[PDB]
Write an enzyme that holds these catalytic residues in place. Structure first.
Site, mmCIF file in Angstrom:
data_model
loop_
_atom_site.group_PDB
_atom_site.id
_atom_site.type_symbol
_atom_site.label_atom_id
_atom_site.label_comp_id
_atom_site.label_asym_id
_atom_site.label_seq_id
_atom_site.Cartn_x
_atom_site.Cartn_y
_atom_site.Cartn_z
ATOM 1 N N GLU A 102 1.670 5.105 11.641
ATOM 2 C CA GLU A 102 2.588 4.322 10.818
ATOM 3 C C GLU A 102 3.977 4.224 11.445
ATOM 4 O OE1 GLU A 102 1.932 2.502 7.676
ATOM 5 O OE2 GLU A 102 0.029 2.705 8.755
ATOM 6 N N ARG A 103 4.791 3.317 10.916
ATOM 7 C CA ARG A 103 6.131 3.087 11.444
ATOM 8 C C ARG A 103 6.907 4.391 11.470
ATOM 9 N NH1 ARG A 103 4.403 -0.642 8.329
ATOM 10 N NH2 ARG A 103 4.559 -2.886 8.779
ATOM 11 N N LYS B 164 0.815 -1.214 0.000
ATOM 12 C CA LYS B 164 0.000 0.000 0.000
ATOM 13 C C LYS B 164 0.847 1.262 0.000
ATOM 14 C CE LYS B 164 -2.226 -1.000 3.680
ATOM 15 N NZ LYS B 164 -1.637 -2.356 3.838
HETATM 16 N N1 ADP Z 1 5.700 -3.012 -6.621
HETATM 17 C C1 ADP Z 1 6.218 -3.933 -5.776
HETATM 18 N N2 ADP Z 1 7.049 -4.903 -6.220
HETATM 19 C C2 ADP Z 1 7.569 -5.827 -5.394
HETATM 20 N N3 ADP Z 1 7.317 -5.870 -4.076
HETATM 21 C C3 ADP Z 1 6.501 -4.956 -3.500
HETATM 22 C C4 ADP Z 1 5.890 -3.912 -4.330
HETATM 23 N N4 ADP Z 1 5.139 -3.156 -3.506
HETATM 24 C C5 ADP Z 1 5.263 -3.672 -2.253
HETATM 25 N N5 ADP Z 1 6.073 -4.747 -2.260
HETATM 26 C C6 ADP Z 1 6.480 -5.591 -1.114
HETATM 27 O O1 ADP Z 1 5.998 -5.069 0.125
HETATM 28 C C7 ADP Z 1 7.052 -5.019 1.091
HETATM 29 C C8 ADP Z 1 6.909 -3.725 1.875
HETATM 30 O O2 ADP Z 1 5.560 -3.700 2.324
HETATM 31 P P1 ADP Z 1 4.649 -2.382 2.221
HETATM 32 O O3 ADP Z 1 4.387 -2.095 0.762
HETATM 33 O O4 ADP Z 1 5.281 -1.333 3.105
HETATM 34 O O5 ADP Z 1 3.294 -2.943 2.890
HETATM 35 P P2 ADP Z 1 2.184 -2.013 3.589
HETATM 36 O O6 ADP Z 1 1.164 -1.760 2.509
HETATM 37 O O7 ADP Z 1 1.690 -2.867 4.736
HETATM 38 O O8 ADP Z 1 2.956 -0.793 4.008
HETATM 39 C C9 ADP Z 1 8.371 -5.100 0.343
HETATM 40 O O9 ADP Z 1 9.249 -6.044 0.972
HETATM 41 C C10 ADP Z 1 7.997 -5.516 -1.071
HETATM 42 O O10 ADP Z 1 8.560 -6.778 -1.456
HETATM 43 MG MG MG Z 2 2.083 0.996 5.191
#
Ligand code: ADP
Ligand code: MG
Ligand code: ATP
Ligand code: MG
Lengths: 110, 485, 472
Positions: free
Chosen positions: C183-184, C157
């Site tokens: 958030e973090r 996200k």
């Molecule tokens: N476009 C993308 N390509 C590959 N991996 C992705 C992509 N978007 C998110 N991720 C995966 O999500 C992880 C980070 O999570 P994040 O996107 O921060 O989740 P949240 O939505 O809970 O914040 C990364 O380790 C990554 O592998």
């Molecule tokens: Mg997030």
């Protein structure tokens, strides 16, 4: 004044009269009136957060440090048993008229 | 002193416990010193529970409270036509005061058992899938249940647009005024909806009542009821009305909020015990009146929002039980290309053919039954076994009938254009045509009749039925076109 | 004379204040308490009665002693607004937290304000190219519209948003407002680094975006107001400046989550699932303020959290209705290795119409859906029997479908440290032609692997050729 509410005091002081605690029951009853006028008291004498038998305990604190204890250490729980601590001031008034009828209702031979 | 006034004891979350008011009625409107109005729902000796129509940051302890003496009512009459009002009936479009003819209460008793008529008047929805399978009738309430992003509003919206065929006319008993009731929606959407109505000159016979999410819970709760009174007006003056609720699912959430906050015990999922009575005394208000009453009528298209396709839910079941049938819409059918994604298997109309047009009734008799057989054969050919002439014949036609029912949004089709298409389907003239051809076939065939065999379209339109002669010409007109190209 | 009061109760993030004077502060007002550490800000919630009020702490309530003196502010929590906020990190309360001196702003408006009038609503149908295939092809975002990014935990996200900021914020021309709600704290810092390096925020120079944070580490009161703080700043540039603004929020869910923690202490009757009765309204007043008006346009990219991957949850389920575009991420897709894990089926937009994206674009998209759908409807059969039992026509659609799905993936420049593959930005024009070419069956010879994590359609044939030399 009405009757049912006024009878509460007369039905509690009735026993008091036999002793002559009208002073300890009429002067005490006066306390219940001031307690209702107390804004802070309104949030305690009518707080549904306490309980049915819990709030009755806290009353003792206002029954042993206000005037009550004897002829008012029963009417206190009764006054806060069903929740008649809203129009109770009317019950105290009747006591003043019922407390005067006890003086005449006695063998006046002496 | 306190008989006509009162002092606020507590306030918060749109709730206000005022003390006094010992002559206020049940569900009576009131006004605070701040200017904000409120509604009394809980009558108790100690205090009175009132719900706020606006923010509560204005009400404070010890404030004065005054009463209205009247039950919460809303302005009614033709004047509202084309205007956009709120729960209370005040203009929110910015085009002058609401010129109303009378004022009726929010809560009105449902019409009597005596003053009723069996539904016989059709409600052209312009949707072939609908007017052919689950017809609507002036005086009934056809549900539109389905998940989010399926096409619930669509069905309703197109209907209003289709009414332009008669509202521009001179005859009154034929027209059909429309009442859209936005509840829970954002102002952004409502604005775009009203924009679309105008783009089709459909705003002139349309009344809109807005109860966006931002407004107070009591507004969203009262919105439908007041809105109904608006429409009931036509019903009483011997005119026809068409109200659409969108959606009662949000309204219950709203009404749930007043209950919980007024400290009223919840039933199931926090909804108030009488949550049923919330939609029951609403939908029953729409029905067909006796000839003595005016032959007036009010049709209702309630909308519900299911979660994960679960129709076994609490609110939905409550409404399915009241409505005269439902137009189930499945997300899964939408992607498959069935648009609008109307599941015939679950969509029914209790009024049935009584409401449907007589002409269209002939051309499609067991059509719904046939589409049932199609899904029966479609599931059985999944095995991967060869099919004989019978099971493949019906499979060929059943697959094309489903493709003929697909109709684009914002594109209502008259009755004179639905009959011909369905005719060529139920019979079997499309069997010998490729599936990706059915698409352009519809448009081409129509243009064919409007140019050559236009006389027939004119007879079907006026007569509304099919004579021995009309079938003959219609028969030959179809075969002649199949031969072409 | 300043109005003063005394504390009567302190339960968690909820403190009850009492005033001796007969004048009580209205609701939504601020309060301050003197402490050795600094000053604790309170916010009125409801008048319990008896000159007693209920308020919500803005920070830790540790150390508060009953009967302690409390000073009134006289107005709802306000925060500085104007170009002076840009390149500065503002706190939920409205004070600098980047150690760079006080924000000398001209005006200071309150976080609480009423939503735009119905007559003030302005609708638009202009497309917004992001560069993301699965988006610009299926559910394109609209200019000054509402964007939503649902998904469970670790679906993509934020990483999805970060890319949107790397591709839109740069070539935008207006202002931006980023607000991290619950958030973090770490992600905020690293976000600060990026804005500096990219040059979006230059300490010595000027900046194009304002940073407002109410991280999860902060108590519920803050996590509840932070969203309002960030929004007040952006609505300024909307009406006052009347300029395009990009409002980035992450995560918006924390807003209701933070409010459901206190609803219990506030004395509200818990609705189903535990959520406060007034979920619909509160969430309502927020979304209604985040919109485009006749004075200015604002494009908002709000990320929504999905508890236990449940879309039927009242929190996210009441969010869809407040969005012009919805892009849902299913963890069932990310686990496949497909990224972004966008679900073409569930994903919807208001711009997916031939009268806007063009007739051809409409048809190509639809064909992609149908194909993907037919693969899903036979999924049950595949696990049980296999493709051997699938018919000739069905077996061809599967492979093609599987090719389309893998093709949806796209290397992200921001997520290069995860994929090890340089970012790939694809234009809308090429994306349409690309899938359309795949539908026509002009690439049924190329292996599926060649569609995985590929940018441009040309790169597919290029990658297919590289796999020929690797075969031994
Ligand atoms: N476009 C993308 N390509 C590959 N991996 C992705 C992509 N978007 C998110 N991720 C995966 O999500 C992880 C980070 O999570 P994040 O996107 O921060 O989740 P949240 O939505 O809970 O914040 C990364 O380790 C990554 O592998
Ligand atoms: Mg997030
Ligand atoms: N007949 C149709 N053909 C093709 N697409 C359609 C049709 N009807 C609706 N849609 C598409 O479906 C999307 C949502 O449709 P609709 O507004 O009917 O759903 P809804 O039931 O109102 O959902 P919500 O209640 O959340 O608004 C729109 O983007 C629209 O383009
Ligand atoms: Mg809708």
């Amino acid at each position: 004044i009405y009757g049912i509410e006024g009878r509460y005091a007369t039905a509690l002081y009735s026993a008091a009269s036999k002793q002559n605690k009208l002073e300890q029951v009429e002067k005490e009853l006066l306390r219940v009136g001031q307690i209702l006028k107390e804004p802070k008291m309104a949030a305690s004498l009518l707080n549904p957060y306490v309980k049915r038998s819990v709030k009755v305990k806290s009353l003792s604190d206002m029954t042993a440090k206000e005037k009550f204890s004897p002829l008012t250490s029963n009417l206190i729980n009764l006054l806060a048993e069903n929740g008649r601590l809203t129009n109770t001031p009317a019950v105290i008034s009747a006591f003043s008229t019922m407390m005067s009828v006890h003086r005449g209702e006695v063998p006046c031979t002496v | 002193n306190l008989n006509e006034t009162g002092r606020v004891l507590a306030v918060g979350d749109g709730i206000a416990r005022v003390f006094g008011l010992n002559n206020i009625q049940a569900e009576e409107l009131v006004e605070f010193s701040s200017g904000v109005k409120g509604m009394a729902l809980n009558l108790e000796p100690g205090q009175v529970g009132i719900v706020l129509f606006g923010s509560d940051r204005l009400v404070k302890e010890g404030e004065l409270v005054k009463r209205t003496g009247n039950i919460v009512d809303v302005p009614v009459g033709p004047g509202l036509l084309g205007r956009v009002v709120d729960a209370l009936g005040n203009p929110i479009d910015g085009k002058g005061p609401i010129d109303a003819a009378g004022r009726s209460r929010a809560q009105v008793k449902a019409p009597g058992i005596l003053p009723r008529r069996s539904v016989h008047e059709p409600v052209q929805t312009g949707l072939k899938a609908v007017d052919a399978l689950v017809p609507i009738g002036r005086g009934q309430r056809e549900l539109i249940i389905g998940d989010r992003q399926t096409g619930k509003t669509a069905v309703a919206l197109d209907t209003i647009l289709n009414q332009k065929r008669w509202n521009n006319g001179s005859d009154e008993s034929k027209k059909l005024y429309c009442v859209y009731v936005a509840v829970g929606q954002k102002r952004s959407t409502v604005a775009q909806l009203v924009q679309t109505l105008e783009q089709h000159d459909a705003m002139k016979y349309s009344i809109i009542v807005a109860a966006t999410a931002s407004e107070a819970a009591p507004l969203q709760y009262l919105a439908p009821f007041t809105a109904a009174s608006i429409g009931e007006w036509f019903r009483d003056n011997g005119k026809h009305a068409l109200i659409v609720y969108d959606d009662l699912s949000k309204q219950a959430v709203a009404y749930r909020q007043l209950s919980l906050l007024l400290r009223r015990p919840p039933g199931r999922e926090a909804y108030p015990g009488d949550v049923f009575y919330l939609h029951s005394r609403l939908l029953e208000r729409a029905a067909k009146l006796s000839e003595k009453e005016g032959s007036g009528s009010l049709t209702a298209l309630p909308v519900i929002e299911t979660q994960g396709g679960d129709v076994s839910a609490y609110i939905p079941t409550n409404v399915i039980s009241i409505t005269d049938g439902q137009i189930f819409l499945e997300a899964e059918l939408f992607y498959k290309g069935i648009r609008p994604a109307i599941n015939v298997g679950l969509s029914v109309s209790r009024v049935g053919s009584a409401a449907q047009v007589k002409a269209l009734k002939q051309v499609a008799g067991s059509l719904k039954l046939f589409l049932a057989q199609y899904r029966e054969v479609a599931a059985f050919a999944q095995f991967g076994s060869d099919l004989d002439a019978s099971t493949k014949q019906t499979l060929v036609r059943g697959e094309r009938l489903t493709q003929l029912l697909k109709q684009n949004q914002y594109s209502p089709l008259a009755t004179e254009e639905q009959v011909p298409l369905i005719y060529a389907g139920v019979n079997g003239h499309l069997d010998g045509i490729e599936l990706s051809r059915i698409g352009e076939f519809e448009s081409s065939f129509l243009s064919y009749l409007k140019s050559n065999h236009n006389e027939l379209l004119t007879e079907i339109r006026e007569k509304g039925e099919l004579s021995k002669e009309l079938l003959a010409s219609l028969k030959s007109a179809t075969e002649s076109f199949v031969a072409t190209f | 004379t300043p109005i003063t009061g005394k504390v009567t109760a302190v339960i968690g993030a909820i403190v009850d204040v009492h005033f001796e004077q007969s004048e009580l502060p209205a609701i939504l007002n601020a309060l301050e308490i003197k402490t050795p550490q600094g000053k604790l800000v309170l916010e009125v919630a409801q008048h319990l009665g008896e000159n007693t009020v209920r308020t919500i702490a803005m920070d830790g309530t540790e150390g508060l002693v009953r009967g302690e003196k409390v000073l009134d502010t006289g107005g709802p929590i306000s925060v500085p607004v104007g170009r002076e906020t840009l390149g500065r990190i503002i706190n939920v309360i409205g004070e600098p937290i980047d150690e760079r001196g006080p924000i000398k702003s001209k005006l200071r408006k309150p976080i609480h304000a009423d939503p735009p009038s119905f007559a003030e609503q302005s609708t638009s149908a202009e497309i917004l190219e992001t560069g993301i295939k699965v988006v610009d092809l299926l559910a394109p975002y609209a200019r000054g519209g509402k964007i939503g990014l649902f998904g469970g935990a670790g679906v993509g996200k934020t990483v999805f948003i970060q890319e949107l900021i790397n591709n839109i914020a740069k070539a935008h021309g207006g202002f931006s407002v980023f607000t991290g709600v619950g958030e973090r704290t770490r992600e905020g810092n690293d976000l600060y680094r990026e804005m500096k390096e990219t040059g979006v925020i230059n300490l010595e120079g000027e900046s194009k975006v304002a940073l407002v944070f109410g991280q999860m580490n902060e108590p519920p009161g803050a996590r509840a107001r932070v969203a309002l703080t960030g929004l007040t700043i952006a609505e300024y540039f909307r009406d006052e400046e009347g300029q395009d603004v990009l409002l980035f929020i992450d995560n918006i869910f924390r807003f209701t989550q933070a409010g459901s923690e206190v609803s219990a202490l506030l004395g509200r009757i818990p609705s189903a699932v535990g959520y406060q009765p007034t979920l619909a309204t509160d969430m309502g007043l927020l979304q209604e303020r985040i919109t485009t008006t006749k004075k200015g346009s604002v494009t908002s990219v709000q990320a929504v959290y999905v508890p236990a991957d449940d879309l039927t949850d009242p929190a996210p389920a009441t969010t869809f209705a407040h969005l012009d575009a919805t892009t849902v991420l299913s963890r069932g897709i990310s686990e496949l290795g497909i990224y972004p894990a966008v679900d073409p089926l569930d994903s919807k937009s208001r711009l997916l119409d031939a009268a806007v994206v063009g007739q051809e674009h409409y048809d190509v998209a639809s064909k992609v859906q149908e194909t993907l759908q037919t693969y899903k409807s036979l999924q049950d059969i595949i696990a049980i029997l296999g493709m051997d039992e699938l018919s000739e026509q069905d077996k061809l659609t599967v492979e093609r479908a599987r090719k389309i799905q893998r093709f949806l993936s796209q290397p992200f420049a921001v997520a290069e440290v995860f994929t090890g593959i340089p970012g790939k930005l694809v234009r809308l024009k090429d994306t349409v032609a690309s899938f359309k070419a795949v539908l026509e069956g002009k690439y049924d010879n190329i292996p599926e692997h060649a569609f995985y994590m590929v940018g441009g359609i040309e790169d597919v044939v290029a990658k297919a050729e590289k796999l020929a030399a690797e075969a031994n």
